[PDB]
Design a protein that fits this description.
This is part of a larger assembly, with chains A (about 60 residues) and B (about 50 residues). The radius of gyration of chain A is 13 Å and the shape is globular. Chain A contains 2 helices and no strands. Chain A is about 20% helix and about 0% strand. Chain A is mainly alpha-helical and about 60 residues long. The longest helix of chain A has 8 residues. Chain B is low in regular secondary structure. Chain B has no helix or strand. The N and C termini of chain B lie far apart (about 120 Å). The chains are: A mainly alpha (about 60), B little secondary structure (about 50). At the A-B interface, loops of A face loops of B. Bound molecules: zinc ion. The site of zinc ion (ZN) has 7 residues of chain A, from loops.
Chain lengths: ~60, ~50
């Protein structure tokens, strides 16, 4: 729905890396370089931000 | 106006439209094979061992 504040496996704050990851993919990085350059080195931390469907930009369209 | 009968007809010609020639090509046209997966270029170790 929204990015988790912590990675599930190890408790790294990955919840501050969603806007500054969209900003790197909009500025033409590959995803194999937009995750190393945010400091996500373990593949449990990369997993949280690579495979994330941010399903609240689709859910706020139904707003009063 | 009597309309008398006649003899037996020998043969019966059947007129029909011809077979569809030059419709199929002499070689066949298959769907091309989906390619085998490639190892992508630019793969390197991004994980360094800590400390
Ligand atoms: Zn982690």
């Amino acid at each position: 729905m929204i990015i988790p504040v912590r990675c599930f496996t190890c408790g790294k704050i990955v919840g501050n890396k969603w806007e500054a990851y969209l900003g790197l993919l909009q500025a033409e990085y590959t995803e194999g370089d937009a995750l190393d350059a945010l400091g996500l080195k373990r593949y449990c931390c990369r997993r949280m931000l690579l495979a994330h469907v941010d399903l609240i930009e689709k859910l706020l369209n139904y707003a009063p | 106006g009597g309309l008398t009968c006649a003899s037996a007809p020998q043969g019966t010609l059947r007129i029909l439209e011809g077979p569809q020639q030059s419709l199929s090509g002499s070689p066949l046209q298959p769907i091309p094979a989906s390619p085998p997966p490639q190892i992508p270029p630019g793969l390197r170790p991004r994980f360094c061992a800590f400390g």
